[PDB]
Design an enzyme around this catalytic site. Structure first.
Site, short mmCIF file in Angstrom:
data_model
loop_
_atom_site.label_atom_id
_atom_site.label_comp_id
_atom_site.label_asym_id
_atom_site.label_seq_id
_atom_site.Cartn_x
_atom_site.Cartn_y
_atom_site.Cartn_z
N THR A 209 47.65 45.85 39.34
CA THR A 209 46.17 45.81 39.22
C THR A 209 45.55 45.07 40.39
O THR A 209 46.08 44.06 40.84
CB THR A 209 45.72 45.12 37.91
N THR A 210 44.43 45.59 40.90
CA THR A 210 43.65 44.95 42.00
C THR A 210 42.17 45.22 41.72
O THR A 210 41.75 46.37 41.94
CB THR A 210 43.96 45.49 43.40
#
Ligand SMILES: Cc1ccc(-c2csc(CNC(=O)[C@H]3CCCN(C(=O)COCCF)C3)n2)cn1
Lengths: 211, 222, 216, 227, 229, 229, 206, 195, 211
Positions: free
Chosen positions: A1-2
């Site tokens: 996740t970013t």
């Protein structure tokens, strides 16, 4: 996740990837990480997907009850405080939440970073996730407050691309929303980063790109 | 009466305990609140036996928190208890919300507390009516009045306590919407003095602004 | 379900406490006399009842004794409570509970029954006689829960006359035995098998032979 | 002085509060239940309080093969209905079978009786008829006093005396009646108490026929057959 | 049917229990208090075999109280007040201001008139004390939890005559001895006696903090002084 | 007692509460295929009040509105409970609650004073709760007896009988939304004593097209008055 | 190791009609960083009762507050001072009420038992109130071994207030000079029936 | 990693803290606003530790103190404030404790200017100069060398600049941004020192 | 005592334009031994919604029974059958209610919503979930998910065929479960295939290897 968010001349730009993985296995690449708290406040999902989803929907419920009771729209600071206070009551139980609440209220555009440890850091540029360092580097190297909507969107897209490119746990599709005075808009509903690699770094597409 | 219901419906549909709490409010001293563009004036009646009672001890013009102030008419001990509950709730809101409690929220909390005491077994209704002046989240000033039943309503200018009807009728014919601080205070005083004996020791008038609540020095009252 | 059965009368009296006082006043006489070197508590009581089983005078602790006038069952309850409180103080502080503090704790316990819901007041009055580093004490506890400090007193039937007798025969500087003789005379005015006496050394209750020896 | 409290007996050995809770059952709308060797049919009058009103619901589904009709206070009826529904569902969750009907009725009767023994509480002011198929068509009636019975046919509510008399006249047909004739019998009993598609509720349950309310067209044709 | 509904409003917005407790206190022995520059004073009028302060009690090194009403309720409230003062010192590491202790004890008084089905405390207090923020303070507390601050007041029987005497005589610039003489004079006036007897007097004073509880001999000396004038 | 039956089989308390809902301002609720409209009178007690602070029409949810009669303090508690429960349903199920379900939740709360399976008495409030769910627009009536009745058109308040009679006379299933507004304001005008004006009444509508609670402004009310006979 | 966080030491001694209680003045942190030098470990309960608390600083302060609360309540309710022996028993019971989650404090109680006769009273404790009543001296703190050596070698019976002051100060200073985590000043209190002498010694501050 | 510094004089008291909000190996912010907690009445609570614990403990203390000052209509004394804070920290020491280092500063007419040093264990004492965090190991000695009781506020600020310089040069975390509270002459000033 | 065992077995979901397929094996095993060769994993929730889970069998069965209980209670209370989306939020909340002692059961909720479009929600143990067009839980999920990605997405093929029908999807699912049985020891025995379309649910059986 970013996930990342930054405040600029015309409001707030929120950007995310869409990958959920279980260890080294990619379980999904169509995850919606930008959750609508209310018509004006958006939140992101970094870390525990179940924790972030459940608690952001719970915060949405609390906010809706509050707005009905007081006939007013809640502020980003108040919602972020509520979320941090709830997440602190569970200190030590292993909740893993990294959330950025960004919205517009009577005090302007606001953006807060709240993690499961109880943090409530207020700022105008944040990033969460395994790819947060790359996002910070790219954003800092080119962040300007007076960027136009198009320029801010391009910057956010490029930062998300680079994070997904260097980070194993990030990837899938880039989604970019714009928060303005009258809600928010899905500027980029979703764009597979496979095209972005061959647009930014290897456009000639005649040999393998060398890192 | 640990859990016995105290407030019940009469054969006609009334809740007699609430009418008795209203009687308690009617027995109390008169107070008046008048709203202006960005400030309010609260003038309450005071009655002390000269030379023997300390005049500073009784404070019916109560600061609740940074931006909200209160006045009451009715039983004094009930008023103190309700005021302490209200202050606790103001701080609880400012702790959980990270923002000071808006006037309307505080007035609604006081109203719900009074309703609760009117709707629970083993508790007597609060025999007090309050006027709460403060500022909303949009920084607008507002004045609310809460009754013993738990009903509340916002007002431009309102008087509570004994002989409240006469003060209301007077303020209706005299409240000229936006008024300067000096003459707004003069109105708040000439309205309250229509019922109380004319004497600087029979009144205390304070004024609420965006900065703080200030009690008026007695020289001006003279 | 829990509400006070003791309530203020329209004139401001607690009629249940007044009624308990009437009951105590219609009870058997007891009295105490505080001497210069001691304090005594005496009391007055069909060929079948064992005497040793119905002693009104009892021992709270090694240097504290108690007698009562009123309801025997309430007295038994309060005696067990007073022993419990004395033992609790001993555990806390390692010394015998001081007489005044025991009187205050029992007074609070008695007052509790005049205010809490669903309970009648204790129908007894207590005389507590004790010795501590601060001398000899003789205290009276009322049904209301108020405690008086006495040099001498009587707490039963016809106690006005007995109070007058004690007043017309009391001197501070009196030996223990002069006080014991005055006590027996007072009880005989109210009225050896009819006499129970305790004296304060650790608190002691006089044997029947000793009492008769005093009756001479 | 003996009807004041819920826990007091009269010198006649009578509880007056429970009898008043039962008297609350006479002013409900008439409902009728009858059974044959395979089915139970329940028909009730829906109350209408104004022209612009929608008729009040009269029968409720408790479980696949269990339904009820009520007469009396409606809030108490809803409380009892939720109790029974959660009971049937909890049974079907803990085990993998439908609840025994006698067990459910006895638990409901326990719930009724509990309220009768404490001053702080009052008896349930509603009478329930329970129609189910547990190996057999069964009709039960509960009462505020915690007593329940099993009936061949049943009726209660306002003016059930006419429905009673009709049922007592026609009881010996119900056993050997077919479904259509049983439905018509229940409808004629209900009519004696006085029907349109709006003011009448009708449900059936039975062998290989889960509890099911009769549709609007079906009710219309059945009422025509009654005429 | 056996419940008396102690915490109910009367038709006039009045609580009958509170009024009857007030009556009971009005039938209690008279206790007085007044403020001098030197400190606070409390006077009070108490069989010959009685040994023993029963009207004035110490709550803390800097707080003391005169009682009117029921003695057992007064003892309960005095114990609870000592508990509150000590708990304040425990929590903050500073002595409790007098007004705060009065507010706590009056809250306990009032909760009995708002909560449960019990009767109110049938006691009223004259709380005197010294703190740095407000100097010398005297407070009157009635059974309903209402309280007020005074420079000189009276409670108990014939409090009106004592109040009139106090108002007529109480000055602002009076010293400890003059305050004590005024206290004796008020105690005598409220008893309708030309001379006050030294066996029916309870005098004590708090000065900056130290409290004096006058023995009978010191009372006799004060009586001599008061009699010369 | 509160839980005592009468000899006729009716609870005394709810019977007495029935007399309370007959007070307060009058509201009217009309349901048509396009949506539901609730219009309420405002008997403004004085010119010093802020008219909009007193609210007779509230939004239990985005798709639910409610008109309130009886004790307004009790009604606010009921509406707050309804809001909390509707939001809880929305969170658990992620859909807008059915209107009948909301009315049943309100009813179960309203009779919680019985203690069959905590409020101390009946609420003494009448609610006219309209909304739009998957079933379409609908309008319900709840009263202190706990019985909740679905209505095509209904009225509550002091002039309940007259408003009901008029709505019966002038209501038909085939009605446009504009006709619904016109009829609602016609009845409201005929019942209230203060002459109808753009500041005297509240109008809220939940339309099938959007199923959103919309409160009318002054311009819309003036429009409807312009369209009135 | 918990006691090493703050260090500290307390030393009581008795003479003829006089008693002495001394302590070091350091408050440290993480066993080596001296953060304060005015942190007195001697607290006065009343004219005839003094206590010296050593161990965790927070526990010292909490226990002092608890003791003050209890003693003030006792004295006000009795209108008289608490007896020293009663205070010692109360302190033991307070310590033992927290046996399984204790206050990490090693108190000593010093004072006079009144009979008037003023008999010196001393008693040491463990963290759960194990009595160590003694008539010559009492030690607690991290410097306990050095302090025991000092009071073993140098204690003289029946010393006047000057002799007692000299002996106790020498004992404390010599013991402290061998201790890393205790020192930085020394406070000495000499009680007699009529007066109290408080002195701050000139000691190493390293 | 949260450097706190406190200095007390006869006529002033100065608090100081680096303005970094950290998250893992990244600075969330270079201008923090969660260490200083101004309390009405010339009181200040400077907290160090973890942001969540800092927020919770500081706001709990701040609202309790303001509730006290509103209910009683009086200003809490700085000593009462400090010991209330230490009491509350010690209460939770054995139940979900806050790992927070504390400096309490204030001014009263009763005790003048006041500085109190309290650790996460709630070991509290009044001091004239104190530090918290790893930076303490590099600043305390400086405060010891250049301090005298009669310092002027300007000399105190120069000593603070010496401390900041040593924290920039020798401390492993090259801290450069600092926020200072200066209570003196009845006024409370906020200053920002870079480098 | 460790309170978790994995009974093996695989569930594969796949959506079409107006239909959804859920195919699950039936083998129940412990370690290297077989409890039984037929233990259904798929439960019917409503005529247009089913749930199939893999993990610890007792947890799965209790969770399915609780879902059915709550759905029937919902029908009896609100007088309408819940949508698949309503069921999906309900199951997410039910799972997160045990967030700290989670059900060891990964789930696939398949159904046809009101708009007659195939809906597939995939869930992990603690409640995190997302809508999908093809999913697989159980031991064979890592073997099968790439097959579904290569057939349904064709991200890495220039020449793409998109027209799929129900028969083609059923045969593809049979091939996928055959491959899972071939390569996964915990997958085998009879497999049940549920097809939900407008007409409702149709159940077919297929035999797989028994070793
Ligand atoms: C936000 C989000 C995204 C995806 C999912 C989700 C849940 S399922 C799925 C697709 N499938 C897998 O990811 C398998 C990968 C290997 C491990 N898996 C097992 O089932 C093994 O466990 C056996 C007993 F449980 C699941 N995506 C849930 N929320």
């Amino acid at each position: 996740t970013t996930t990342l968010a930054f405040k600029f001349k015309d409001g707030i730009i929120v950007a995310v990837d869409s990958r959920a993985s279980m260890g080294s296995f990619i379980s999904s690449q169509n995850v919606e990480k930008i959750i609508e708290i209310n018509k004006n406040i958006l939140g992101t999902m970094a870390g525990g997907a179940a924790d972030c989803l459940y608690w952001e929907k719970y915060l949405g419920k609390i906010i809706k009850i509050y707005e009905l009771r007081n006939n007013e729209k809640i502020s980003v600071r108040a919602a972020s405080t509520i979320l941090s206070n709830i997440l602190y009551q569970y200190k030590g139980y292993g909740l893993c939440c990294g959330i950025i609440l960004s919205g517009y209220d009577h005090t302007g555009f606001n953006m807060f970073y709240v993690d499961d440890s109880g943090k409530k850091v207020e700022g105008n540029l944040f990033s969460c996730g395994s790819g947060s360092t790359y996002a910070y580097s790219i954003l800092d190297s080119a962040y300007d407050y007076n960027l136009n909507l198009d320029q801010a969107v391009e910057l956010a897209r490029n930062a998300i691309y680079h994070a997904t490119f260097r980070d194993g746990g990030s990837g899938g599709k880039v989604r970019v929303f714009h928060i303005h005075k009258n809600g928010y808009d899905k500027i980029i509903e979703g764009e597979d980063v496979f095209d972005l690699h061959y647009h930014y770094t290897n456009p000639e597409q005649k040999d393998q790109y060398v890192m | 009466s640990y859990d016995r219901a105290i407030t019940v419906f009469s054969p006609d549909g009334h809740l007699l305990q609430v009418e008795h709490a209203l009687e308690a409010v009617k027995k109390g001293g008169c107070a008046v609140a008048i709203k202006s563009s960005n400030f309010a004036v609260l003038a309450v009646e005071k009655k002390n036996i000269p030379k023997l009672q300390n005049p500073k001890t009784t404070e019916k013009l109560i600061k609740l928190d940074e931006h909200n102030c209160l006045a009451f008419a009715g039983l004094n001990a009930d008023a103190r208890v309700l005021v302490n509950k209200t202050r606790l709730e103001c701080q609880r809101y400012y702790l959980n919300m990270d923002e000071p409690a808006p006037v309307d929220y505080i007035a609604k909390y006081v109203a719900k507390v009074q309703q609760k005491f009117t709707h629970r077994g083993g508790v007597r209704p609060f025999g007090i009516a309050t006027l709460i002046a403060g500022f909303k989240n949009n920084k607008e000033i507002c004045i609310y009045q809460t009754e013993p039943s738990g009903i509340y309503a916002a007002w431009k200018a309102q008087a509570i306590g004994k002989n409240a009807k006469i003060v209301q009728e007077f303020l209706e014919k005299n409240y000229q919407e936006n008024m300067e601080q000096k003459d707004c205070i003069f109105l708040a005083l000439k309205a309250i003095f229509e019922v109380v004996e004319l004497s600087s020791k029979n009144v205390e008038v304070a004024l609420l602004t965006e900065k703080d609540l200030t009690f008026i020095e007695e020289q001006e009252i003279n | 379900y829990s509400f006070s059965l003791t309530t203020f009368s329209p004139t401001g009296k607690l009629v249940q406490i007044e009624y308990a006082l009437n009951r105590v006043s219609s009870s058997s006489p007891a009295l105490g006399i505080r001497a210069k070197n001691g304090v005594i508590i005496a009391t007055e009581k069909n060929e079948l009842i064992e005497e040793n089983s119905i002693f009104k005078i009892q021992q709270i602790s090694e240097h504290i004794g108690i007698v009562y006038a009123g309801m025997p069952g309430d007295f038994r309850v309060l005696l067990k409570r007073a022993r419990k409180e004395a033992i609790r103080y001993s555990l806390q502080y390692g010394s015998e509970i001081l007489v005044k503090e025991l009187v205050k704790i029992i007074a609070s316990i008695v007052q509790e029954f005049t205010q809490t819901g669903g309970v009648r007041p204790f129908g007894l009055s207590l005389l507590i006689c004790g010795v501590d580093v601060y001398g000899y004490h003789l205290y009276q506890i009322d049904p209301s829960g108020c405690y008086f400090n006495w040099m001498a007193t009587c707490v039963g039937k016809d106690y006005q006359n007995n109070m007058s007798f004690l007043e017309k025969r009391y001197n501070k500087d009196i030996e223990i035995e002069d006080a014991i003789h005055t006590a027996i005379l007072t009880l005989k005015e109210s009225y050896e098998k009819n006499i129970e006496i305790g004296v304060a050394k650790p608190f002691k209750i006089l044997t029947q032979n000793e009492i008769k020896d005093y009756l001479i | 002085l003996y009807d004041t409290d819920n826990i007091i007996y009269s010198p006649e050995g009578r509880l007056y509060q429970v009898e008043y809770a039962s008297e609350a059952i006479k002013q409900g709308t008439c409902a009728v239940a009858i059974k044959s060797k395979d089915y139970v049919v329940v028909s009730g009058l829906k109350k209408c309080i104004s022209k612009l009103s929608f008729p009040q619901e009269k029968i409720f589904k408790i479980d696949d093969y269990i339904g009820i009709s009520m007469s009396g206070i409606t809030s108490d009826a809803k409380v009892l209905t939720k109790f029974m529904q959660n009971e049937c569902l909890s049974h079907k969750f803990l085990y993998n079978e439908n609840i025994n009907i006698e067990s459910l009725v006895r638990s409901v009767a326990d719930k009724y009786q509990k309220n009768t023994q404490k001053s702080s509480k009052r008896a349930f002011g509603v009478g329930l008829m329970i129609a189910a198929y547990h190996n057999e068509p069964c009709i039960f009636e509960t009462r505020p006093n915690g007593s329940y019975f099993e009936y061949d046919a049943l009726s209660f509510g306002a003016r059930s005396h006419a429905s009673k008399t009709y049922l007592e006249k026609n009881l010996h047909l119900f056993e050997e009646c077919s479904l259509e004739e049983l439905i018509l019998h229940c409808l004629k009993a209900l009519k004696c108490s006085l029907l349109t598609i709006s003011n009448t509720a009708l449900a059936v349950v039975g062998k290989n026929h889960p509890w099911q309310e009769i549709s609007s067209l079906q009710l219309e044709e059945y009422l025509s057959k009654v005429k | 049917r056996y419940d008396s509904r102690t915490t109910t409003f009367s038709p006039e917005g009045r609580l009958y229990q509170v009024e009857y407790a007030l009556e009971a206190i009005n039938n209690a022995s008279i206790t007085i208090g007044l403020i001098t520059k030197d400190g606070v004073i409390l006077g009070a009028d108490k069989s010959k075999l009685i040994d023993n302060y029963e009207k004035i009690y110490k709550i803390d090194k800097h707080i003391f109280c005169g009682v009117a009403g029921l003695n057992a309720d007064a003892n309960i409230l005095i114990n609870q007040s000592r508990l509150y003062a000590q708990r304040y010192l425990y929590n903050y590491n500073e002595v409790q201001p007098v007004s705060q202790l009065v507010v706590q004890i009056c809250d306990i008084k009032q909760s009995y008139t708002q909560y449960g089905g019990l009767r109110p405390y049938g006691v009223s207090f004259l709380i005197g004390g010294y703190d740095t923020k407000d100097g010398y303070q005297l407070y009157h507390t009635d059974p309903s939890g209402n309280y007020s601050g005074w420079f000189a007041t009276a409670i108990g029987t014939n409090n009106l005559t004592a109040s009139s005497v106090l108002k007529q005589e109480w000055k602002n610039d009076m010293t400890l001895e003059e305050g004590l003489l005024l206290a004796l004079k008020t105690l005598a006036k409220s008893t309708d006696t030309e001379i006050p007897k030294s066996e029916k007097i309870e005098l004590a004073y708090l000065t900056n903090v130290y409290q004096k509880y006058l023995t009978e001999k010191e009372i006799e000396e004060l009586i001599k002084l008061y009699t010369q004038k | 007692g509160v839980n005592t039956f009468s000899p006729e089989g009716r609870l005394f308390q709810v019977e007495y509460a029935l007399g309370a809902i007959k007070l307060g301002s009058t509201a009217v609720g009309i349901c048509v295929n396009d949506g539901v409209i609730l219009a309420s009178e405002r008997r403004i007690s004085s010119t010093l009040i802020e008219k909009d602070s007193v609210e007779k029409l509230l939004s239990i949810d985005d798709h639910i509105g409610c008109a309130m009669s009886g004790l307004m303090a009790d009604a606010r508690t009921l509406i707050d409970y309804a809001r909390v429960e509707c939001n809880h349903y929305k969170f658990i199920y992620n859909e807008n609650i059915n209107i009948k379900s909301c009315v049943e939740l309100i009813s179960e709360l309203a009779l919680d004073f019985s203690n069959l399976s905590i409020m101390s008495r009946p609420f003494g409030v009448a609610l006219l709760i309209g909304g739009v769910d998957k079933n379409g627009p609908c309008l319900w009536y709840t009263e202190p007896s706990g019985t909740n009745t679905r209505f095509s058109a209904a009225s509550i308040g002091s002039a309940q009988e007259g408003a009901e009679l008029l709505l019966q006379e002038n209501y038909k299933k085939d009605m446009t939304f504009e006709q619904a507004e016109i009829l609602a304001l016609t009845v409201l005008r005929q019942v209230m004593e203060d002459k109808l004006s753009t500041s005297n009444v509240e109008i809220c509508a939940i339309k099938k097209s959007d199923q959103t609670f919309y409160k009318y402004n002054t311009d819309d009310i003036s429009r409807i008055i312009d369209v009135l006979p | 190791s918990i006691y090493n966080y703050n260090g500290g030491c307390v030393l009581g001694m008795s003479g003829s009609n006089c008693v002495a209680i001394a302590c070091d003045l350091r408050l440290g942190a993480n066993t080596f960083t001296t953060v304060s030098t005015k942190f007195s470990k001697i607290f006065k309960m009343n004219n005839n009762v003094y206590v010296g608390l050593s161990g965790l600083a927070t526990d010292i302060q909490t226990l002092y507050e608890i003791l003050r609360y209890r003693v003030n309540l006792y004295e006000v309710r009795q209108d008289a001072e608490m007896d020293v022996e009663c205070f010692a028993n109360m302190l033991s019971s307070i310590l033992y009420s927290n046996r399984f989650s204790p206050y990490f404090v090693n108190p000593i109680v010093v004072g006079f038992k009144l009979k008037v006769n003023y008999e010196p009273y001393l008693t040491a404790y463990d963290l759960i109130g194990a009595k160590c009543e003694t008539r010559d001296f009492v030690v607690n703190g991290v410097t306990s071994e050095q302090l025991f050596g000092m009071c073993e070698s140098l204690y003289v019976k029946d010393q006047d207030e000057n002799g007692l002051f000299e002996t106790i100060s020498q004992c404390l200073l010599s013991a402290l000079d061998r201790d890393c985590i205790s020192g930085w000043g020394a406070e000495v209190l000499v009680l007699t029936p009529e007066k109290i002498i408080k002195k701050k010694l000139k000691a190493r501050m390293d | 990693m949260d450097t706190l510094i406190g200095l007390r004089g006869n006529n002033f008291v100065v608090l100081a803290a680096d303005t970094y909000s950290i998250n893992s190996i990244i600075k969330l912010k270079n201008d923090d606003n969660t260490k200083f907690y101004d309390i009405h009445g010339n009181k200040c609570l400077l907290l160090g530790g973890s942001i969540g614990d800092r927020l919770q403990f500081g706001e709990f203390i701040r609202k309790n103190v303001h509730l006290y000052q509103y209910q009683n209509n009086t200003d809490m004394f700085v000593k009462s404030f400090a010991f209330f804070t230490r009491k509350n920290l010690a209460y939770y020491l054995r139940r979900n404790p806050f790992e927070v280092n504390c400096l309490i500063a204030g001014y009263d007419k009763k005790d003048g200017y006041q500085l109190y040093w309290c650790d996460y264990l709630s070991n509290m004492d009044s001091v004239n100069k104190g530090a918290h965090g790893y930076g303490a190991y590099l600043v305390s000695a400086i405060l010891d060398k250049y301090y005298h009781e009669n310092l002027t506020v300007d000399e105190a600020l120069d000593i603070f600049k010496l401390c900041f310089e040593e924290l920039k040069k020798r401390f492993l975390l090259t801290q450069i941004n600092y926020e200072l509270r200066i209570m003196y002459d009845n006024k409370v000033e906020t200053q920002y020192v870079t480098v | 005592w460790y309170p978790y065992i994995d009974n093996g077995g695989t569930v594969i979901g796949l959506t079409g334009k107006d239909y959804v397929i859920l195919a699950a094996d039936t083998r129940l095993s412990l370690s290297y031994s077989i409890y039984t060769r037929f233990c259904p994993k798929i439960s019917k929730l409503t005529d247009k919604c089913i749930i199939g889970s893999s993990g610890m069998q007792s947890d799965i069965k209790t969770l399915h029974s609780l879902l059915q209980k709550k759905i029937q209670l919902f029908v009896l209370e609100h007088s309408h059958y819940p949508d698949i989306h309503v069921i999906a939020r309900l199951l997410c909340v039910i799972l997160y209610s045990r967030r700290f002692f989670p059900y060891y059961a990964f789930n696939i909720l398949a159904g046809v919503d009101e708009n007659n479009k195939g809906v597939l929600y995939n869930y992990d143990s603690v409640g995190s979930y997302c809508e999908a067009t093809h999913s697989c839980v159980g031991s064979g999920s890592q073997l099968i998910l790439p097959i579904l990605d290569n057939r349904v997405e064709q991200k890495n093929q220039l020449i793409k065929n998109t027209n799929f029908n129900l028969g083609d999807d059923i045969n593809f699912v049979k091939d996928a479960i055959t491959s899972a049985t071939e390569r996964d020891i915990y997958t085998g025995d009879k497999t049940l295939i549920y097809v939900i379309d407008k007409m409702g649910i149709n159940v077919n059986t297929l035999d797989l290897k028994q070793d």
